[PDB]
């Protein structure tokens, strides 16, 4: 029985991710801003009981980290989910993005991802798997993200430090994932990510990869 | 004589850039935030006569583009070269950035260059280029940006957004280049960058290229 710590599991593919790998057989840890007021999630933890834990969590709060380690205790962490992505500006437009938007933005799908996963990076498993949910958006080289660039440039940063990070190890300690889920059911896509992070475990690799466990260009 | 735009000329690469564009025989407008307090501009500026002309300007208001507009005339634009770029703060720690912080780097670094090329966009000579000063720390394949990883992300993101322009075009109207200075005089930096720009001219291609016009991967 292996620990799996989801931040972002109220809703969307964080709350299929939940329901794969808590069918794998994992005890899993749900973190979500509002858990109460998710009826999956709800629903999702009272089957399975004690196997899904709900904890109060807001990512871009700097206590976050603090909240997950004290309600986990002395336990360590084998798969690690980074899943909180916003899109940005509905319209997308660089001329019309004020500071706020931008701090927010690049705060919520870059910056605060990093925060967090630093802040637990000493209770992860070595040889376990910290992931982030990213895009194929963030991929420079396929270039897909001309009808949504803010969020496209906000992923490539997200990439961008997780490069970074990983390059501060002589080996890494455990795998460095950055997930496109893809668009295709959650259940589907939730499924196919499952495989992609267990088949980076006792690897050590920073990977790029979609649902399929395709690696995807930087 | 082609009409050659400097954004962020007052010092460094952009003066080297405005004097190496010079030499070739170029109509030079240098901008600047503080035109009358940089010693090289002035002198430059004096030298040419009116072949450099100094415009201020910041990047970073909403009125520049009108201000470069009105202050071109009618002329078109053959080579638009954005030289903006901040390192962000020094510490480069996504536990201790703030939103302020965070809002001027990715303003300053990737969105703020892209509103501007985009509102000039429309007076660039078809065929022409749009370079961008980039760095060899936005390559997540080269994975350079470990000590400097918020600096890596914002160029990054500036590559990512250059990327999703060229997206919105069946095919290019003019070239767009990300470049890299290589830190090495600033005159041997910006004679090779101004060669690596003029061999994109007629081309209409997206290149990411260091002072010697060598490609960068991604
Ligand atoms: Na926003
Ligand atoms: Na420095």
């Given at each position: 029985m292996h620990n799996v710590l989801i931040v972002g599991a109220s809703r969307g593919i964080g709350l299929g991710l939940a329901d794969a790998f808590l069918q794998r057989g994992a005890q899993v840890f749900a973190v979500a801003r509002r858990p109460q007021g998710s009826p999956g999630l709800q629903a999702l933890a009272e089957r399975a009981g004690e196997r899904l834990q709900a904890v109060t969590g807001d990512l871009n709060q700097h206590d976050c980290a603090e909240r997950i380690g004290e309600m986990l205790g002395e336990r360590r962490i084998d798969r690690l989910i980074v899943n909180a992505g916003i899109y940005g500006?509905?319209?997308?437009?660089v001329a019309e993005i004020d500071a706020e938007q931008t701090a927010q933005l690049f705060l919520t799908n870059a910056i605060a991802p990093l925060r967090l996963a630093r802040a637990l990076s000493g209770r992860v498993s070595r040889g376990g798997v910290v992931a982030f949910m990213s895009s194929?958006?963030?991929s420079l080289a396929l270039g897909?993200?001309?009808?949504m660039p803010l969020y496209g440039a906000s992923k490539a940063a997200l990439n961008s430090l997780v490069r970074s990070w990983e390059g501060?190890?002589?080996?890494?300690?455990f795998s460095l994932l950055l997930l496109?889920?893809?668009?295709?059911?959650v259940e589907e896509s939730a499924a196919g990510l499952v495989a992609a992070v267990e088949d980076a475990a006792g690897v050590n690799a920073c990977r790029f990869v979609d649902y399929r466990n395709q690696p995807l260009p930087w």
């Open positions: 500006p509905q319209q997308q437009d194929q958006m963030a897909l993200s001309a009808t501060e190890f002589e080996e890494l300690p496109h889920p893809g668009w295709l059911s």
